[PDB]
Amino acid sequence: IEALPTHIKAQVLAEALPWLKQLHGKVVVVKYGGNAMTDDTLRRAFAADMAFLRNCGIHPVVVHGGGPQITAMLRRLGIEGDFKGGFRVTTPEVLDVARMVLFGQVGRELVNLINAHGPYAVGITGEDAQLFTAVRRSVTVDGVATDIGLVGDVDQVNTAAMLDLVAAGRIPVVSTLAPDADGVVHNINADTAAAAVAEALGAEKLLMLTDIDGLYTRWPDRDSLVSEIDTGTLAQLLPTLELGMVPKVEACLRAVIGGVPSAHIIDGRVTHCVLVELFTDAGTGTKVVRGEGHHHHHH
Amino acid sequence: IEALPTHIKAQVLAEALPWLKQLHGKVVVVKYGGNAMTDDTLRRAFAADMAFLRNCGIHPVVVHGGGPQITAMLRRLGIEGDFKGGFRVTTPEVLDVARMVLFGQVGRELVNLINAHGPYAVGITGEDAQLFTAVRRSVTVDGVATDIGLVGDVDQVNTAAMLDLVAAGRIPVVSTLAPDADGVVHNINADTAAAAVAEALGAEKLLMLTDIDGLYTRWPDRDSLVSEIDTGTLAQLLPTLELGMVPKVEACLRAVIGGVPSAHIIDGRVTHCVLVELFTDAGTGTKVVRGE
Amino acid sequence: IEALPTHIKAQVLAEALPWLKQLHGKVVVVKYGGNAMTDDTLRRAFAADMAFLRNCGIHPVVVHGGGPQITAMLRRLGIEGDFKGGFRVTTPEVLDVARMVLFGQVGRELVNLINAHGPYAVGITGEDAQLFTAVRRSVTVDGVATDIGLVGDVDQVNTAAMLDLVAAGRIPVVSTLAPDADGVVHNINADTAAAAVAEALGAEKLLMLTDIDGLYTRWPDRDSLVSEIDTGTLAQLLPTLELGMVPKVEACLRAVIGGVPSAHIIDGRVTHCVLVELFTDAGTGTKVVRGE
Amino acid sequence: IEALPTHIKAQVLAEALPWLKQLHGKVVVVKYGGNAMTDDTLRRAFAADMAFLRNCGIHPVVVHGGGPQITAMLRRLGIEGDFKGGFRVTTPEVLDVARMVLFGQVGRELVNLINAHGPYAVGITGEDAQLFTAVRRSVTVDGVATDIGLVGDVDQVNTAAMLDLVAAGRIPVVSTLAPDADGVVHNINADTAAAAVAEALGAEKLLMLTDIDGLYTRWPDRDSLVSEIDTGTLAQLLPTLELGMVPKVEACLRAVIGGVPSAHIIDGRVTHCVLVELFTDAGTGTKVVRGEGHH
Amino acid sequence: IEALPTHIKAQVLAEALPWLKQLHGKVVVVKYGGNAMTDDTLRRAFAADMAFLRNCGIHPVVVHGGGPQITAMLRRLGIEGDFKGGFRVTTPEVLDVARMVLFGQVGRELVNLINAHGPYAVGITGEDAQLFTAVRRSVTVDGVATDIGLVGDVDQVNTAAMLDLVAAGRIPVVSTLAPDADGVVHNINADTAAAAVAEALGAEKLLMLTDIDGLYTRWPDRDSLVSEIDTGTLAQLLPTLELGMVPKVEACLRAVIGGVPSAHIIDGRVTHCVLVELFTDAGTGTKVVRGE
Amino acid sequence: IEALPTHIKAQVLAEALPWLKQLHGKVVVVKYGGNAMTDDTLRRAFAADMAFLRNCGIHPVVVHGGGPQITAMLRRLGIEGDFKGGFRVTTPEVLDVARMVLFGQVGRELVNLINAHGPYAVGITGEDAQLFTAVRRSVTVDGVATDIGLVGDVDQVNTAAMLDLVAAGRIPVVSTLAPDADGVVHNINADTAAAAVAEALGAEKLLMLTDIDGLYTRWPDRDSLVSEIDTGTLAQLLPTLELGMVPKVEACLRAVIGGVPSAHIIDGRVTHCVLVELFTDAGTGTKVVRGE
Ligand SMILES: [Mg+2]
Ligand SMILES: [Mg+2]
Ligand code: NI
C-alpha cells in the first residue's frame, strides 16, 4: 500500500520500461464498458489511467457503449420497444434516445472524468466531420431478412482526421454512432466499432474491458480459460461460443488480422485494469495474436 | 429566378465581391436559434449557408441554444420545475437534461444538416478539451442573492485550440455548456457565450438570428428600426426595449468593444438570412459598429 | 435596378453553393481575350471576377494574348509582315514586338487591374524560371511543311512550380511566350496554350472567352442552346463550325480529353460573363464534357 | 588562358573563402546598367556571375534600368518630348513605352541570359503582387514645384514577398516601375530604387555598375578618385557633383544609412566586375561604409 | 520481487501520474558520476532509467565527468602531474588526455549503455557545432594562484541547437569540454557545467548523483541533514562547507536562480536512484528551490 | 599572389561555375588521411576547404581514419599485439584504445580545425544514434578463417538521420566505429566505410586523399598512370595491385557501381587538394566512373 520500501517501488516502475518503449508514440484503442462505467472507483481509475498513457507519450483512443443507460431512458421516457425477434429493434425514435444518452450523457461523464487531469478528452461520433460512416446491418433466424432497425457496422474511417486529434494531444472519446451513405445515423456495436477504428488507425493494441476474467473455449468449464489464443484457432472456435463473446471475439479477429499486432480481453472489474495489462506481465485476460497454420493449432 | 434576366444575376453575384474579400480567411461566429431551428426549410437553408461560407474560405463558428427543447424534455420526462420568479432553476438534475438535449440532440441535428454538404461540422462544448470554462452567475430577483442554479457565463476561452479546428477546415458547432473553476459543468446563455467566443477568436463578425426584424428605437412603430447603429448610441437606447432584446443587444456591445469590428442582429425568419446579411448590402437587421 | 426583392438576391447567391463546393481549392484556367480586353467596362469586370474567385478560395490562372495589339504595334513601328500561305511570318524583329506588347503592355494591363483588389496578379512567361518551354511549330502552305518563323507550341510545363504560385495566393497572368529547347523564345497561340497549361496543372475547369455568342449547329435560333455538349458530338461537329471558332473548340476538346473535367466557351462580351458561367447555367455558351 | 599552375589556382580560390563566408545566405542587390547591358561579352559575363552567386548560396537581386532603350523606342514611334528643365515629363503615354521596353524587352534579355545557366531569373516590377509602391516625385527646376510626369521614388516594399522569391532559389530581375497609392504606376530611378529594395531586404551589399572607375571629388587626375568613403564625407560632396553622379551617390547614402553594411560603386566596363569586387581584395571601386568611421 | 500482487504493483504505477505530468515534454539535466559510473549494476540501471524518461515523453540530457579515469590514464601514460598546491595543472598535454578519456571512453560507455534500448544517446562536447563555449578559470589558493591551466567555466550555450537534439528524440551525452574564445579547448567542471546547460535549456529539473545521501548542515552530524532548502539559505551555508560539495552546491544555485524550478542532490549509490527521485515521494537527497 | 592581375583571378573563379553548379546542394564524402592529417599546413588547408564547400551550399561529410595514431597509443600504453598473418587482432582491449584515439583525439583535432571557421563540424561514430551498424568481417590468409578481432564492415546506414545533419548546416566528422547486431562496437576501415556512407547518402562525389599521385595500373611504370579509369576496367586490376591500393580501389568500386556518379583518388600531399579536384579542370588524381 504505502509502507512499501522505496527500493521496491522503483523495481516496479523500472519493469514497465519494455512496455513503455513498445507503446510510446503508438495508438491504443480502449473499449470502455461494463462495471468500468458502473462502479465509481473503477471509472475514476479508468480516467486516471488514460491520463497516465497520455502523459507517457502514448495515444489512447476511447470507444464506449451504452445499453443499460439507453434502456433506462427508453423506460423512464416510456417507449414501448418493438421486438422483431429476439432483439430490441432500433427504430428512429429509439435512435434519437440512444444517441442522446450515449453522446450527451455517457460520453460526457467520461470526458469530464478524464479532463479532471487536463485538457485531454474530446467527445466525437461518426457524425462529427464524418470521422466514420456506417452500413446498415441485420440479424438472422434463417431467412436473415429481419430488419432490426437503424443498426449498422463501421464502414469507412477517416484515420487521417483521427490521427490529427491524437497529434494535438487530445484523447478522443468515441460514441458509436455513424451516418450511412445516405446520411441517416445508425447505432453501432461498441465492440465491433472499437475494432474497426483500431485497425484503421494502425493501433499497437486493442483493449476491451469486460465483467469476465477472460475468454472461455467452452464457457461452463472455467478450466478452458486461455490467457492467449492465436487467430487461426479463434476463427474455428467462433461458431461454438457464447453469443455475448461473439462481438468481442470477432472484433479481436478483425483487428489482429487487420494489422493490430494484438488484442486483449481484460477484466474491467479490476481497479486500474489497463495499467496492469500494459505495464505488468500478469497473465490476466486473453491475448489475441495473428497466427495461421496447422502448427498454430497443433501447438 | 429563371425568368430573371442574366444581367441581373451577374450584378447580384458581383456585388458580393467586396464582402467575400472582407470575410475571406476571417472567423464569423453565428448564433443559431429561434425559427431558424424550428422551420425545416429555414434550418436546411442555414446549413447550406454555413457550407457556402466554408467553401469560400470563410471560417464559420456556430453557437446554438435550446430552451424549448430543454423544457419539452423536462416535461415529457416528468421533471417538475422547482422555480424562482421567472427562472427555471437549473438543478443538478436539470443540467443533465439540458446538456443531454443541447449536445446529444439539438447540436446533432445541426451537425448532420451541415455535413450533408461535406465533413465540415463538428460538435463541441466547453467540456471538450476544456475549450472554455464558466463562472457561476446569478440573476436579479429580490436584492439579487438568488442562486438560480448551475447557470453561468463564459469565463476563459482557448482561442488557440479553437482556431485549430477552423484551420483544419471544420465548422465547430458549440453547445453552451462549460465547467466552472472546480470543474462542474454549467449551462451558459447562447447569446452571451456566442459573444464571448466571438471576441476571443478575434472574429470579423458576430451574427445573431432572431424572430425579430431589427432593433427598435420606437416600438411598435415599424419605421423606426435602425439599419445601422453604433456603440455608445446603443447604450443610450439600451434601457428602452424589453428583456428579450437586452441579451442580444448587450452581447453585441461586449462584442464590438472586445474587438469584433461589428455585430449584427438579423431576422432568422428569412430564408438564407445569413447570405443576405453578408453578401447583400441590404441589411437584414441592425449592424453595430465601434463609434468614436 | 435595385427594386430586386431581398429574397430574390438570397435565391441567386444560394443557388451558387453547389458550384462553390465544386471549384473551391481547385485550379481554373481562364483564357482572357477578345473584346474583354478592348472594352473598358468588360475588362475592368474581368479583373473583378478573378478577384472574386481568389476570395472564394479558388485558383485562377489567366492566359492571354495580343493579336490586334501586336499588329497595331507593328503598324506603328512600320514592320511590314512577310506572309506565306496566309501566314504572317514571325521574324526575330516581330518576336521582339510580341514579347513587348504581350508581356509589357497587355499583361501589365490585367495585372494592374486585378491588383486593385489585392496582391494577387503576377505576370510571367515561359522565360521566367523556365516555367514552361516551347516546341517549334511547322505548318504546310501548299504541299508540305514550312517554317513560319518563331511560332511554337507549349511543350514542357513546371506544373509543380506553377501550382506553388496559386498556393501562395498569387494569380499568375500568363503571356504565351516560351523558350525553345535551346533557349529560343517563341510566340505561342493563347488558345492552344491555355488548353495546354490547363491540362498540365490538372485543373477542374477551362474558361475560354470569345467574341462570338454561341456554338452553332445552324442558326434557327431555338437549336443553338447547346448549353452542354460532349467530347464526341463536337468532334463530328468540327467539320461544320464557324471559321472563327474552330481553335476555341479544338482547345476545349484537347483539355477535356486530356483530363480536364469541363471546358467552357463563354461569350466574354457579357459583363461578368465568368461569374454567370460558373454559378448559374443561364445560357453563357457551351460546356464541353467527357462523353462519346 | 591556361598555363597557370594549379597550385596557384587553389590559392586564388582559397582566398575567396572569407568573402564567400561573409555573403553566404545573404542578399546582394546589384544595379545593372551602362556598358554592362551594351557590350555582349560583358552582359554574358554578368549573367554568369549572377549564376555564380546563386550556386554559392548567395541571394542576388538584380535591378536594371533603361533610358537609351526607352529613348530609342520613343524615337521609332516619333513620341517627341515636352522638356521643361532639361528633362522629359513622363506623359501617360511615355510611361507605356518605358514600361514596355524595360519589362518586355530590357528585362527579358537579362532573364534569358541568366536562365542560360538554370531556372533562376524571374522578372518582376512593383506592379506584380504589389512588391513595392511608388510616390510621385518632382525635381526642382527654378523654384521647387514642377511636375515632371509619371516619375517617382520607391515608397514601400514588401520585403516579405521578396525574400520569398530568393528563398525558392529564384533570382529576381526588377524593372523599376511601381504603383502609386491611388493605383498609378510610375517610372522609378533604377539607382535609387535599387537602394530602396536593398535596405528593405536587409541586403549584405549593394553593387552599382557604372562606366566610371570610381568616385571623384573633382574632375582631373590622381588623388580624389577615392576607394573608401562614408556618410558626411559624401554628404558634403553632394552639392559639388554633376547630375551625372548625384542619384548614384545618394543611392549609396540612403542605403548605408538605411542599414546596408556597405555599398559599392564599381566599374561595369570590366569583364566579371562583380566577381572581382566580391571575391578579390583588389577593390577597384569606391566603397561606402558606415559614416562613423573616418568622420 | 515478482511475488508482489497485481493491485499493489498497479498502485505504485498510479502514484507516478502527478510526476509524469509535471515532467512530460520537459527537459531534465542529469549529472552522472560517482559509484553510478563505477558499479556495473548501477550504471546499467542508470541507462535503463534514461530510456524510461525518454519513452515517457521526457527529455533527458546527461552530463558526465571523469577524474579517476583521467588520473588513471595520466598514470598509465606516465605523465607526472605538475601540481600547484591542491591542484594538478592542466597543461596542454593533460587536456589532450582528459578529452581523450572523457569523450572517447567514459562517454562512449554511457552512450552504448543507453543505446542498448534504442537509437537514443548521442555524445557531444562544447566543441561540436560550438554547442557551448568556455572562459578560462583561475582558482586562487591563498590570496592568489592564477591559472591552474586549461580549466574553465561554461560561458555561453546554444540552447537552440541543443533543444533541436532533444526534439529529434535523442538523449545527448555531454562531455564537459569547451572551446576558448580563441578556440582553445578547456576542461570544465561537470557539476557546474551541468548547472549551466540546465539553466540555458530551461530545464524542469537538475539531478546530481553523488556518493552521499544528502546535503550536510554541520558535516558529519548525520541525523538532521537537509531534506529541502532554497536559494537564500543555501547561499548562506556556502562559506561553511567543504570543497567536496561547493561545486555541487554552486551548481544548484546557478541553476535554480537561473530559472530551474528545482535542483536535486540524490544518492547515486542507490539502484534506479533517478526513478525513485522522480516518480516516488521518497524524501531522500535534497531539493533546492528559489522560493516566494 | 597579389602580383597576379585581377582579370586573371576572375577567370579562375569563373571557370569554377560549372562545378559549383554541379555540386550545389549535393553531398560530398571526403576520406581524410595520410599526410593530410600529418602536415600542419595541409590539414589547416583541408579544414579551410571543408568550410569553402560548406559556404557554397555544398554538403561535405568527412570520414577519417587512424592507424599510426592508434599504434602510437598502443605502444605508449605498452600493450603487446597478438598477430595473425600480419594483423593486430583487435581484441576488446585494443578496440577501446582505437576508439579512444580515433574519436577522442584524431576526430577532435579535425572538428576544432573546421570550427575555426564557424559552428560547422560535429563528430560522430556509428555508435551515436546508431547512425550505422557493422558486421564482423574476417581477413583472408589463404584460409579466410582468421578472426582478426573486432573488425568489420559498414552494414546498414541511417541515411535519414545523416541527411538531417547536413540539413542543419553541420559538417559531420565520422570516426569509423560502429555497433554490432548485439552492440559490440567494431573498428571499420575508413576507406570502405567512407564508400558505404557515400552510397547511402546518395553523394554526388567521393574523394579519397592519399600519399600517391594516381592509380598506377599494374606495378611501377610511371607511364601506366591512368587519369580516368572506370568500373570493370578497374575491377580487372585488383588481383594485380599493391596492398596499399586494394582497400582504396575496392572502395571506389562500391561507390560508383553503387550509385555515386564518380569517385576520385587524389593526392593529399598537395595543399588545397580538394579545391583543385573540385573547381579546377586539372587532370590530377585518378577518377572513376560507371561503365557497364
Ligand atoms: Mg496455438
Ligand atoms: Mg452553362
Ligand atoms: Ni501430433
The DSSP result for E118-178, as a single string, is: SS-EEEEETTGGG-EEEEE----SSS-----BSEEEEEEE-HHHHHHHHHTT-EEEEESEE
Beta-bridge partners for B265: B208, B286
> Rounded to whole angstroms, how far apart are CA atoms E255 and E235?
12
* Binding residue positions of E for substrate: 66-67, 88, 187
C176 neighbors C193 (Cβ within 8 angstroms): yes
Within D35-158, where are the H helices? Answer: 35-38, 40-54, 68-76, 92-101, 107-114
Fold of E1-292: Carbamate kinase (3.40.1160)
In angstroms, the separation between the Cα of residue A58 and the nearest Cα of chain E is 8
Chain E hits for A117, Cβ within 8 Å: 17, 21
Tell me the CA–centroid distance for residue C247 and ligand 1, in Å: 72
Contact yes or no for B276 and C15 at CB 8 A: no
- Rg of chain B taking only CA atoms, in angstroms: 19
C123 neighbors C92 (Cβ within 8 angstroms): no
Q: Is B266 helix (H, G, I), strand (E, B) or coil?
A: strand
C27 neighbors C166 (Cβ within 8 angstroms): yes
> Rounded to whole angstroms, how far apart are CA atoms E100 and F99?
10
The resolution, in angstroms to one decimal, equals 2.8
E128 neighbors F128 (Cβ within 8 angstroms): no
Chain C hits for B11, Cβ within 8 Å: 272
Sheet holding C286-289, edge to edge: C121-124, C171-175, C59-64, C27-31, C205-210, C262-267, C286-289, C229-230
Q: What is the DSSP letter of D166?
A: H
Chains C and D: 3 or more CB pairs within 8 Å of each other: yes
Residue E90's contacts (CB-CB under 8 Å, 6 or more residues apart) are E98, E148, E149, E150, E151, E187
- The structure's method of determination equals X-ray
CA torsion, ordered D239, D242, D248, D250, to nearest 10 deg: 10
Q: State the maximum Cα–Cα separation within chain F, in Å, rounded to a whole number.
A: 63
Contact yes or no for A99 and B108 at CB 8 A: yes
Q: Is A11 on the interface with E (CB under 8 A)?
A: yes
Cβ neighbourhood burial of C3 (10 Å; 0-12, 13-18, 19+): exposed
In angstroms, the separation between the Cα of residue E148 and the nearest Cα of chain A is 42
In angstroms, the separation between the Cα of residue C218 and the nearest Cα of chain B is 24
Q: Pairing mode, if any, of strands F228-230 and F262-267?
A: unpaired
Q: Is B79 helix (H, G, I), strand (E, B) or coil?
A: coil
Question: What is the H or E stretch that residue D174 is in?
Answer: strand D171-175
- Spans of all domains in chain D: 1-295
Chain B hits for C279, Cβ within 8 Å: 13
User: Quick one: cell of A2?
Assistant: 504505502
A157 neighbors A131 (Cβ within 8 angstroms): yes
Q: Which CATH number fits the domain D1-295, given the four candidates 2.40.50.140, 3.40.1160.10, 3.40.50.2000, 2.30.40.10?
A: 3.40.1160.10
> Rounded to whole angstroms, how far apart are CA atoms A240 and A249?
12
Residue D168 CB neighbours (<10 A): 12
- Rg of chain C taking only CA atoms, in angstroms: 19
> Rounded to whole angstroms, how far apart are CA atoms E278 and E272?
10
Q: Is B158 on the interface with A (CB under 8 A)?
A: yes
The residue type of B34 is: G
Work out the angle between the directed axes of helices A190-200 and A159-167 (0-180°, nearest 10). 80
What phi and psi, each to the nearest 5 degrees, are found at residue B127? -70, -45
User: Quick one: cell of D197?
Assistant: 529594395
Q: Pairing mode, if any, of strands F262-267 and F205-210?
A: parallel
Question: What is the H or E stretch that residue F9 is in?
Answer: helix F6-14
Contact yes or no for A272 and E11 at CB 8 A: yes
Chain C hits for B8, Cβ within 8 Å: 1, 4
> Rounded to whole angstroms, how far apart are CA atoms D190 and D29?
12
Contact yes or no for F122 and E105 at CB 8 A: no
Cα–Cα nearest to C256, from C25, C22, C29: C29
Tell me the CA–centroid distance for residue A290 and ligand 1, in Å: 10
CA torsion, ordered F274, F275, F276, F281, to nearest 10 deg: 120
Q: Pairing mode, if any, of strands F186-188 and F177-178?
A: antiparallel
> Rounded to whole angstroms, how far apart are CA atoms E250 and E137?
15
Q: Is A105 on the interface with E (CB under 8 A)?
A: no
Q: Is A47 on the interface with E (CB under 8 A)?
A: no
The helix, strand and coil proportions of chain E, stated in percent and rounded to the nearest 5, come to: 40, 20, 40
CATH of domain A1-299: 3.40.1160.10
Q: Which of F13, F21, F117 sits opposite D275 (nearest CB)?
A: F13
Burial code of F87-110, b = ≥16 C-beta within 10 A, e = fewer? bbbbeeebbbbbbbbbbbbbbbbb
Question: Could you tell me which chain F residue has the CA closest to the CA of E105?
Answer: F100
Cβ neighbourhood burial of D52 (10 Å; 0-12, 13-18, 19+): buried
> Rounded to whole angstroms, how far apart are CA atoms F25 and F57?
6
Whether C35 has a binding-site annotation, put simply, is no
F172 neighbors F124 (Cβ within 8 angstroms): yes
> Rounded to whole angstroms, how far apart are CA atoms D249 and D244?
10
Work out the angle between the directed axes of helices C6-14 and B6-14 (0-180°, nearest 10). 80
Q: Pairing mode, if any, of strands D59-64 and D171-175?
A: parallel
Angle (nearest 5°) at CA D141 between D136 and D146? 40
Contacts 24+ apart (CB under 8 A), B223-227: B225/B286, B226/B286, B227/B283, B227/B286, B227/B287
Beta-bridge partners for F123: F173
In angstroms, the separation between the Cα of residue D88 and the nearest Cα of chain F is 40
Cβ neighbourhood burial of D276 (10 Å; 0-12, 13-18, 19+): buried
Point out the ligand nearest to the CA of residue A228: 1
Q: State the maximum Cα–Cα separation within chain A, in Å, rounded to a whole number.
A: 65
Point out the ligand nearest to the CA of residue C207: 2
Chain B hits for A158, Cβ within 8 Å: 119
Chain position carrying cell 503582387: D129
> Rounded to whole angstroms, how far apart are CA atoms B39 and B50?
17
Q: Is C227 on the interface with B (CB under 8 A)?
A: no
Positive or negative: CA dihedral F239, F240, F242, F245: negative
Q: Is A135 helix (H, G, I), strand (E, B) or coil?
A: strand
CA torsion, ordered D227, D232, D236, D241, to nearest 10 deg: 40
Residue E91 CB neighbours (<10 A): 14
> Rounded to whole angstroms, how far apart are CA atoms B131 and B173?
12
Question: Could you tell me which chain C residue has the CA closest to the CA of B46?
Answer: C14
The DSSP result for B132-189, as a single string, is: EEEEE--B-SSSS-B--SSEEEEEEE-HHHHHHHHHTT-EEEEESEEE-SSS-EEEE-
D51 neighbors D117 (Cβ within 8 angstroms): yes
Question: What is the H or E stretch that residue E199 is in?
Answer: helix E190-200
Tell me the CA–centroid distance for residue C266 and ligand 2, in Å: 8
